[PDB]
Every structure is written in C-alpha cells, then in structure tokens.
C-alpha cells in the first residue's frame, strides 16, 4: 500500500480543498482518466482501482499512477470524550481537484482502455471521465 | 455379539448384500443393492432382533506422505544415570520416494561405510523407521514413499544398545516429518459407467462435480461406457445418486488405482 515513507511530521492540519489541480494533461501515455469531481481519494481506493486495470489488460501496457497520498488522516479512538489531545494517524489520502488526470494508460487500443477505465471508476468515489493525449 | 449374529441369520435370505468388518477401524460395513434394499433391512433388525444400531456412514482410510526432501535429520538419546548410560546417535535423510505401483514405499539403503554405527544395529534402526510408518504425524494413517538413506552417525563403546538406536532413529524420523512437511494421501477409484445414449452428458458433470477427472468415453451399439477417476470420499451413495440420474438404467463399477494428496478442502478435514 502506497504510503509516504518517513516524512517531516506525523500529524498535519485538516486543511482545505480549494481551486483547480495542477496536472491536467495526459503526459506519459495515450489515455487518461480525469477527475471531474472534487474530493479526497484514499490509499485503499487507489490500489483498488489499480487492480481493476492491472486485471483489465492482464499484462499489456504501462500504468501511471499520477497522484500520491501525502496527506495523513487521524481519528479519535472509539468513545473517548472530545479534547485530550490530537488524534491518532489512521490512513493516508491524496486531495483531488477537478481537472486532475489520475490514471494514465498507454499500450492498449483506445477500446480496452475505454473499457478499463469503466472498472477503475466504479471503485473511486468522485465522478471521473476519460481523456486522451493531445498535441500541445 | 447378537448383531454379528443378526446378519448371520438374515444373510440367509439374500446373498446380494454382503458383510465386511473394517480392516483398520473394526467397524462393520454393510453393503447392498440400493437405499430401498437397505432401508427395510434396518427395520428387519430394529424390530426382529431389537437393534437400534445407529445407522452411520461408510468410513475412510486417508494415507499421508511427505511433500519434499529433507536435509539432515539426526538422532540423539542421552540419559545416562551411570548404570545404563545409553547413548545412540544417528543422522539420516528420508526422501519422497518414487511413486511406483510396487508396495515398496520403504527402502533403506545403508550409506555408512565404516563402523561409525555397528553392523549389529542396522536391524534396530531398520526396525525403527518401519514401525513409525504406522504413526502418520497427523493422526496415524498409512505413510509411504519415504526414501531413507542413513548417512553418518556415532555410537558409544561398550554401552550403545539396540534401545538407543531404535528409539533414537524415531526421534530423528519425526524431524524429517516435522521439517519436510508431509500431507495426506487419499485413495482414488477408477469408476466405469455404462450410460445408454441420453443422460450420458449430464452424468459426466455429476461425476465431474465429484472431483472426477474425466478419462474418456467409448461408444458401442447400446451404451457408452465411461472410464473415470474419482476420490473415494465423494463416492458414497453414488448408486442411487446415479440411477436417479440415469432413470435407473446404468451400471457403475469401482476400481482402485492410486493415492492422491488430499487438497485443502479435504485435507484439513481429517485433523483431529
């Protein structure tokens, strides 16, 4: 499971999710899934969506995982009165904004990739579409 | 005592059903023509000879053999107390033998050259390994295909006796098992079925459902006979379970062929 190995700090602020993401192009391959939503993907979902594709081709093509968690989420232990310190690190997530290219796939005809992304999306929360590499 | 009697004065009515008595488990095994044939007999004793014998289910054998080679396995028995001081040390290696049709799953070739273990002690370890083969380290079921070659060892002057090496062989023996990870062996049957023309197919899947590895179907004027391999566990009730498929028109027969390493689904289901 992808996880930032050995970073600066363990717990970090709740933060905010404003604006538009940076990576909006299909950079590495030929086909890519762009996220038309605005939410927070978890590491669990990431690898899950990976399996749907890793299975969708069985062995052909190259898969690029654009995003990376980099955000630690905590949670208070069950039934503990509020207060008494900051939570305990549970799991990691990667913030998402619209117009972000998440999975970039190359090596297969537009057909299967179109089909492949239909499987990845069913595991991810936010609405996403399928976009292609264009010229400049 | 009167059940052994019960059959003897009921068997007279019909030779069609026969009588056994478990080779290894001392449980009587009833045989017959079908559920209808058997059903009334149960009452024939439950009333005529007063026998509420809890009508169980046919039983099993379930062999067990090693999965792979071993590496060093050695023996060592040292409890001195002065007067006895029995000290015997051996170092064997057993291997998964070739699965062959011969009943020689045991073969101990002596690799020792010189007096590291006295000649008058080969019989002891020889005696040793074979008896433990009736103590399959799951629950004590028939073990075979153990390629044993004794490599090196030692002994104690004046002292060393048969006691040391027969038992010390076993302690070494057990390691080869607790370290090369054996696994069960299930007996396998060759079952031939004559199915006219029409339910042939649907019969196969039933047999296929019984883990039955298909062998081949050969056609004749009336009835295609089928050669089939099936684990004996899946076999109970088959007759009726078959005639209900073939509308009571088929004829199956049973032949043993070989022993198979029982899979997970069946494997753990013996451990107790």
């Amino acid at each position: 499971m992808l996880q930032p190995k050995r970073t600066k700090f363990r717990k970090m602020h709740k933060g905010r999710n404003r604006g538009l993401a940076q990576g909006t192009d299909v950079s590495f391959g030929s086909f890519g899934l762009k996220a038309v939503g605005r939410g927070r993907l978890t590491a669990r979902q990431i690898e899950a969506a990976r399996r749907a594709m890793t299975r969708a081709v069985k062995r052909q093509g190259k898969i690029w995982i654009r995003v990376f968690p980099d955000k630690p989420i905590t949670e208070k232990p069950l039934a503990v009165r509020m207060g008494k310190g900051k939570g305990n690190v549970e799991y990691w997530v990667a913030l998402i904004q619209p117009g972000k290219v998440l999975y970039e796939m190359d090596g297969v005809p537009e057909e299967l990739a179109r089909e492949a992304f239909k499987l990845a999306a069913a595991k991810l929360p936010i609405k996403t579409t399928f976009v292609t590499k264009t010229v400049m | 005592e009167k059940m052994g009697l019960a059959l003897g004065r009921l068997a007279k009515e019909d030779p069609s059903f026969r009588v056994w008595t478990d080779e290894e488990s001392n449980q009587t095994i009833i045989a017959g023509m079908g559920e209808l044939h058997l059903d009334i007999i149960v009452d024939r004793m439950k009333r005529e000879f007063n026998v509420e014998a809890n009508v169980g289910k046919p039983q099993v054998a379930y062999r067990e053999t090693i999965r792979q080679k071993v590496t060093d396995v050695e023996g060592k028995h040292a409890k001195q107390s002065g007067g006895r001081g029995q000290y015997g040390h051996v170092v064997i290696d057993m291997y998964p033998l070739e699965p062959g049709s011969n009943p020689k799953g045991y073969e101990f070739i002596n690799d020792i050259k010189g007096g590291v273990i006295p000649g008058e002690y080969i019989p002891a370890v020889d005696k040793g390994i074979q008896e433990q083969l009736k103590a399959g380290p799951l629950a004590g079921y028939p073990v075979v295909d153990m390629g044993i070659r004794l490599h090196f060892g030692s002994y104690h002057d004046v002292d060393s006796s048969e006691l040391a090496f027969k038992l010390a062989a076993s302690i070494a023996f057990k390691e080869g098992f607790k370290k090369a990870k054996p696994v069960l062996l299930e007996p396998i049957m060759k079952v031939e079925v004559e199915t006219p023309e029409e339910n042939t197919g649907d019969v196969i899947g039933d047999l296929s459902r019984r883990r039955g590895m298909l062998k081949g179907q050969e056609s004749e004027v009336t009835g295609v006979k089928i050669h089939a391999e099936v684990p004996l566990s899946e076999m109970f009730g088959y007759a009726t379970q078959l005639r209900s498929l073939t509308k009571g028109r088929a004829s199956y027969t049973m032949e043993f062929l070989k022993y198979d390493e029982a899979p997970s689904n069946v494997a753990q289901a013996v451990i107790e």
Binding site: - | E1, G4, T21, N26
Partner: protein
Amino acid sequence: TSYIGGEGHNLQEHSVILIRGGRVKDLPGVRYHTVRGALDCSGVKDRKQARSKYGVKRPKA
C-alpha cells in the same frame, strides 16, 4: 483372556470362539483355550501329526 493354539487364527475383535480348560503358564492371565475345530478358529492349516489337536481334516487325497 484365552489361548488360540496354532497359526490358524483368523479373528480381529469379533467372531465368536469356544473355550476349553488350560492356562499357558507364560502369558499373564490366560487360563483357557480354543477348540480348533470350533466356531471362528478351525484347524491349523493342514497338519497331519497329532491332529486331534490343531484339528485339521487329514489329507483326503
């Protein structure tokens, strides 16, 4: 416990026998015998000598 004299026994945990008198002196407990020519332990595999014991039919041939 009782004794079956002669390598002609064929029983395991069942199969009724007959009993006659006589211990064996070396087997702790055994104080009776079997009548070879009885229920579940008939004659000992065709012996011709003193076969009124080990009871096997003589050579009819």
